[PDB]
Every structure is written in C-alpha cells, then in structure tokens.
Design a protein around this ligand. Structure first.
Ligand code: AMU
Length: 306
C-alpha cells in the first residue's frame, strides 16, 4: 500500500508520478510550470498542493503511506530555497521524507539512471549540471530568465523578437521573423508587441514558444534565424565545457544527456551542440534520456527507502 511521489517542477509543466516501491508508476498529474523566481510563494504553494491533491484523489489514499517525496524543481537550488519548497509540502501535513533537488538532478537520475554524468536542459530555461566519478557535482548557467538562461527557449524567443524589431526599424538585417512573429501572435503591427510583452501577463513559456517560429523560418532559409539557433547551441556547449573543466573530466569517459523542448526538438541546434562536443570532448558519450524527469524524481525518492 506504500508508495513514493516524484515531482518534476519543470519550465514547461509541473509533472508528478506516483509509484509503488517496485517502480510501477500508478498515475501521473500535470499542472502549469511554477518557479519561485517568476511566481509568488503563495502561487507556487497552490500549484504544488493542487498537483499532489489531484494525484491522491486518483490514487484513493492519503499521504499517510507515502514513504518519500522527491521534488526536482527549477528555481530553488539554494539552501534557503530548499526549505521554502519543503515547507510547501509539509503544509499538506506530510510526515515522511522530503528530498528537494534541482530539475537537472532529476533529469540526470531519470535520463542516465545513475549518479554520474552530465545533463543539459534547454527548455523554457537552461542549465548544465554534472557529477564526476569522485561524486562531486558542479553547475553552470541556470541563472534564470533575466540574468541567465542563455541558449534557452526564452532567450531564443526574446532574440527572435529583437531581431524582428530591428528588421522593422532598420537597425538590423532583414528577416522573415519581422512578419512571422506577428502572424504567430495574431498581432497586426509591431507596435502591438508593447502591450503583448509589457501589459498582458505574458508568461515565460509563451515567449519560449516563439522558438517554433525561429525553427520554421530557419527551414525556409532565413539567415537571421539560423544564426540565432547556432548561437544558442554555442551557449549550451559553453555550459558543458564549464562543468567538464570544473569537474576535471576533460580527458575522461562521461555520459551526457539532454532535456527540454529546445535542445531535443531542433535538429540543427542539437547537431551543432553535438558537433562541438564530439570535437572538443570525444570521450563524452551522448545518449537520449532513458526515462523522464518525473521518473528520475521517483528514482531519487525510492532509492532513499529500504
Ligand atoms: C533562477 C532560476 O529560476 N533558474 C532556473 C534553473 O533553476 C536553477 C536550479 C536555480 O534555481 O538555480 C533551472 O535549472 C533552469 C532550467 O529549467 O531554468 C532557470 O530559469
């Protein structure tokens, strides 16, 4: 009757799996993404509570037989932030073990099924996290949508808008993004981007969705869009180079995987990223994720149980 909960607090959705102790996933639940750096504490708490309560309703059991909860979330990697998320879950009256980690850590667990390896996330945000054979971890990037997230979908979306505006106002190279962005957002004029960006409650996910427009334009031969994708791939490579160097893995066999809708969806960006790794770190073996991040959280939670 015992079970564990794994929660992926990702940049695109919050995703929960409830699993037996023999790794049979009984059910899953999806809610909107919720990050303490882009939502209020009260709003993040409400998302997490609704997520868990919905799953418990489908399960037909309370938290009493839940042996462990692992949440890997964007936005809460610092010691005080982990306490903030832990308190949100304790607010449900949960009495068991709570493991708070970052979203890269659960992507590593789910993707590689081991403690050692490197993960790059590029979805709404971006980060690189790794752990070497010595068990030491490092991260680069991951500084959020204002002071970081280079090479993320949010960054690509902002850069697409800026390129469209420079095309329109004559500061930059002509690009079909000029009109394609307006068409995607159903806006008549570039002036309408002001109300859209500053006065409509636009979300990070909505901005990141413009990556689709950049990919479509690249496939139509647009040179500015190709450059945006190439530069994003380079930023993601730099995040790997930093972690590899910090962890002393420049000359060592390492397994690397990738998570998020930017790095995993765009053929050209993925290929450029892989080309950088294959040339500079040929002993890095690149694989696809064996399981999703929510299952990685299940692994972390269940592994702490007898
Ligand atoms: C400040 C912030 O929100 N950074 C988040 C990252 O969170 C890290 C763990 C952190 O909080 O330091 C997250 O890994 C990446 C990928 O999803 O997206 C960034 O936007």
């Amino acid at each position: 009757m015992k079970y564990v909960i794994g929660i992926d607090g990702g940049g695109s959705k919050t995703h929960m799996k409830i699993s037996t102790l023999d790794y049979k996933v009984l059910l899953e639940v999806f809610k909107g993404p919720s990050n303490i750096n882009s939502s209020t504490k009260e709003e993040v708490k409400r998302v997490l509570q609704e997520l868990i309560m919905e799953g418990l309703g489908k399960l037909g059991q309370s938290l009493e037989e839940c042996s462990a909860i692992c949440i890997g979330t964007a936005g809460a990697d610092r010691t005080e932030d982990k306490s903030i998320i832990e308190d949100m879950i304790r607010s449900l009256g949960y009495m068991g073990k709570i493991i708070v980690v970052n979203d890269a850590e659960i992507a590593l667990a789910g993707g590689i099924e081991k403690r050692e390896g490197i993960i790059v996330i590029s979805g709404t945000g971006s980060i690189c996290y790794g752990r070497n054979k010595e068990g030491r971890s490092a991260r680069s990037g991951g500084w959020g949508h204002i002071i970081g997230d280079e090479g993320s979908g949010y960054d690509i979306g902002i850069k697409a808008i800026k390129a469209a505006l420079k095309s329109f106002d004559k500061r930059g190279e002509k690009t079909i993004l000029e009109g394609d962005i307006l068409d995607f957002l159903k806006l008549k004029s570039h002036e309408d981007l002001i109300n859209y960006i500053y006065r409509s409650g636009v979300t990070k996910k909505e901005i990141a969705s413009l990556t689709r427009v950049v990919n479509s334009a690249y496939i139509k031969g647009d040179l500015v869009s190709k450059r945006i994708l190439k530069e994003a791939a380079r930023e993601l490579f730099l995040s790997v180079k930093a972690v590899v160097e910090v962890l002393s893995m420049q000359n060592k066999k390492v397994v690397l995987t990738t998570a998020g809708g930017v790095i995993n969806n765009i053929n050209y960006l993925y290929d450029e990223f892989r080309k950088f790794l294959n040339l500079n770190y040929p002993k890095v073996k690149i694989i696809s994720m064996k399981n999703d991040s929510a299952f990685g959280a299940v692994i972390i939670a269940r592994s702490e149980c007898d």
